[PDB]
Write a protein that binds this DNA or RNA. Structure first.
Lengths: 150, 52, 139, 51, 108, 126
RNA sequence: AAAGGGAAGCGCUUGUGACCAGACUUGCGCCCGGCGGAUCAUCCGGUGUUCUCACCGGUGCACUCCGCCGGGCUCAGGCCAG
RNA sequence: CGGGACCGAGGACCGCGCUCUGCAAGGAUGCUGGCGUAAUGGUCACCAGCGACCCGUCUUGAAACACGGACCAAGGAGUCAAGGUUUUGCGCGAGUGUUUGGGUGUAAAACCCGCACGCGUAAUGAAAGUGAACGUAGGUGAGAGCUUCGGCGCAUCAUCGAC
């Protein structure tokens, strides 16, 4: 026998989505290829967030996107691996180019009316395959009733 | 066939959904020049020779 | 659009009506499936470009998918019957599989299936009689 | 433009008429959602049993 | 479903005051902030006001028709005069409506 | 026909795993059941006792599910079933299901002789 | 049919007796000789296609193609061994 | 420099090399014999050498004690409902929930409809009541990613402020 005081640890992170969405499966295949064949850390982060669950993907509002568009970020492509929601407290939506998993109808309509562009992640892979000139945004993770009651 | 559009335009509270994937052809996406032009050179093949 | 061969594979990779699943392997009844194996490479009903070979009264009959008639099932198959020398059949099948880039990866499988069908169309040899063995069987 | 679909007559031959394809035929194909809704919907005609 | 349960796997191993006769309809008074005030305007007319295609017209908003009784003052307003009809209003909300150039009218 | 060339087939254990005390009680079937008594000698693995199945007895991945001729059994019910083995006569053999009638068996055997497919029970119902 | 000098039953491994599943029976490729037929190569026309690849109809007049029958040769073939 | 035992994993080439026409250099080939069948192999019964307490329960720290078991077939024990909570999948999203009801129907299905209502969008106080921007929704230190290479800095954490 061998004396192993320490213990080899199995991985504690997701390697595949639990979702049976076939479009998400195709997106996972695409970003697996991209993260394997490119040196960009952006593709690895995007693939690992595509693995994640819904409580680990909180929504991002247009007010949050407009907040992060300030100070020289007006021309960067906004990348959100989550749902982009509308905020009616924000009366004036600036022009922006956002790629997301999905948009709400009001958020998509308000972006297109303000003159920006909405993209999917495969369109993001086509136009910025290495994630150049991109602003990666996450929503508030701890802003949940369960997390408040923890 | 003529009435199907009116049928889905008369459903209140529902719109035809937006897909999370714009191009479903993964072969076209991967073998497009935009992705292939920025890739790193392959670090191996499908089969690997046994070293020792 | 919303439909691709990749998506059809994702939909029907776990179950379809052509699937025959057993302990020793998974097979497919699909007509456009060379080698009768369940895989994306061989799923002819899934793939946009695909080939299939069936026996005829004499020789082989090869069908190929037409990409411009995918929504027209009655006119989606390009069908040629080869009832000639086996070498000419192999040459024509390899030509329509590899020369114009129409699934050059299926060339070996198509030539193999044509050879198997043409060998099956040969007359069979009579089997040797069974030899009785042991104690109870011989007596 | 939007695609068209052929109209066939009583003899099985095309009539020369086409119809614009409805926009529902380009909806996402989601087997997991179809399975969930089918699992829910297949139980709605059930009659109760009890000893 | 029964077949997914762990039991199938384990097969083989086993102050203050009291208010008598309280009526909530007395104390019904929903409140809306001023950063949600423009959402009560229909979207097309709201976009025309925000773009500035109505320089001779001011909108009148009745909160009771929308189901609100009090105007609260969270957020800020654009520089557009808005007439607000409400049963109750907070001091900061009235101050910010006056700064925006409108008036808060009291109704019953 | 003859099977494809393969590595020699090795069975790590030929004897079956018999249930404890199934040789002494007729109400106990000889099918394996893992003993769960805390004082059970077979469960505690004393020497001289019955062995317990484990994954270390597993067969080689290259020869698993192979009959001694080197083929893998494929259960068939009709001629369309046996024609699925057109491309695998050196890897899969055909085995006719028990409830197939004699005349359909003759049809399957004739088709399998034309295709060069081994039939495991070709002498049945003759 | 077998065993039995105050228990049987069970595990590992031989042996004896009884009873069995496989595997094998020859294939492929050449060189000759003898048959039986022109769905040999090229060209022409039509048709279909993946738009350069094929099928069909005429043309082969037998040193070319396709099967069969006798030999000879090489290779691969089952089990146990030196 | 002999003598012996056990083993032959892999399966076109690629590499390191050497004594360089080639090789013992990233894993066994070559030659030959008998047999081609119960000969090898397998199952069953038995003898032989060695090994081997009767199961379950209970108890405590453990044994022992104690309890149940003549045999076989069939039956036989963590279920359903309501209400919470954490996590997963899905739809929509500052909204969400058609199915109390109404319309419709190929009629307990499916499809369609909307007023109210529930939850959420605001809290605090016993109550009367009051009710959330000084600032690009603040400062500092980190922080993935991006960058025009100066910095911009998600989530989140620590800390100082504001309401």
């Amino acid at each position: 026998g061998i004396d192993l005081r320490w213990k080899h640890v199995r991985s504690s992170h997701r390697k595949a989505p639990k979702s049976d969405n076939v479009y998400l499966k195709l997106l996972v295949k695409l970003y697996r290829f991209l993260a394997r064949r490119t040196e960009a850390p952006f593709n690895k982060v995007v693939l690992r967030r595509l693995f994640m669950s819904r409580i680990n993907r909180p929504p991002v509002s247009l007010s949050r996107i407009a907040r992060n568009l300030k100070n020289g970020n007006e021309k960067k492509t906004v990348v959100v691996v989550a749902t982009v929601t509308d905020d009616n407290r924000l009366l004036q939506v600036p022009k922006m180019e956002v790629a997301a998993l999905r948009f709400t109808a009001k958020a998509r309509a308000r972006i297109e009316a303000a003159g920006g562009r909405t993209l999917t992640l495969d369109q993001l892979a086509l136009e910025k395959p290495t994630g150049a000139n991109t602003l990666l945004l996450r929503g508030p993770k701890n802003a949940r009733e369960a997390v408040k009651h923890f | 066939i003529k009435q199907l559009d009116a049928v889905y335009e008369s459903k209140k509270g529902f719109f035809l959904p937006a897909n999370i994937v714009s191009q479903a052809d993964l072969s076209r996406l991967i073998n497009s020049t935009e992705i292939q032009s920025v890739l790193r050179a392959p670090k191996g093949e499908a089969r690997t020779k046994r070293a020792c | 659009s919303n439909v691709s061969a990749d998506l059809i594979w994702e939909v029907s990779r776990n179950y379809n009506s052509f699937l025959v699943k057993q302990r020793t392997g998974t097979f497919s009844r699909d007509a456009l499936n060379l080698t009768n194996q369940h895989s994306r490479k061989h799923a002819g009903f899934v793939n946009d470009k695909a080939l299939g070979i069936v026996p005829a009264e004499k020789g082989v009959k090869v069908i190929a998918k037409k990409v411009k008639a995918a929504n027209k099932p009655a006119s989606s198959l390009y069908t040629v019957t080869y009832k000639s020398t086996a070498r000419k059949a192999y040459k024509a099948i390899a030509s329509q599989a590899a020369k114009h880039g129409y699934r050059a990866d299926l060339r070996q499988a198509a030539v193999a299936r044509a050879s198997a069908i043409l060998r099956s169309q040969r007359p069979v040899k009579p089997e040797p009689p069974k030899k009785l063995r042991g104690a109870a069987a011989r007596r | 433009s939007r695609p068209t679909v052929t109209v066939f007559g009583a003899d099985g031959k095309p009539t020369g008429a086409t119809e614009v394809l409805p926009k529902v035929f380009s909806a996402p194909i989601r087997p997991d959602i179809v399975k969930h809704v089918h699992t829910g919907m297949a139980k709605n005609k059930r009659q109760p049993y009890a000893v | 479903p029964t077949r997914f349960s762990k039991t199938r796997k384990h097969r083989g191993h086993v102050v203050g005051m009291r208010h008598f006769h309280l009526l909530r309809n007395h104390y019904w008074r929903p409140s809306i902030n001023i950063d949600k005030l423009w959402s009560l305007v229909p979207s097309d007319v709201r976009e025309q006001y925000l773009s500035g295609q109505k320089k001779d017209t001011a909108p009148v908003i009745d909160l009771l028709s929308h189901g609100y009784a009090k105007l609260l003052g969270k957020g800020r307003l654009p520089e557009i005069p808005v007439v607000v009809r409400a049963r109750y209003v907070s001091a900061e909300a009235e101050r910010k409506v006056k700064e925006a150039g409108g008036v808060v009218e009291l109704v019953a | 026909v003859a099977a494809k060339k393969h590595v020699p087939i090795v069975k790590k254990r030929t004897k079956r795993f018999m249930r404890h005390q199934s040789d002494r009680f007729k109400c106990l079937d000889s099918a394996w059941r893992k003993p769960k008594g805390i004082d059970n000698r077979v469960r505690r693995r004393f020497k001289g006792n019955l062995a317990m199945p484990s994954i270390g007895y597993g067969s080689n991945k290259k020869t698993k599910h192979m009959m001694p001729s080197g083929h893998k059994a494929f259960l068939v019910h009709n001629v369309k079933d046996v024609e699925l083995l057109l491309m695998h006569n050196r890897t899969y053999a055909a085995e006719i299901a028990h409830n197939v009638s004699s005349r359909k068996r003759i049809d399957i055997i004739t088709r399998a002789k034309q295709l060069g497919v081994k039939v495991t029970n070709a002498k049945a119902k003759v």
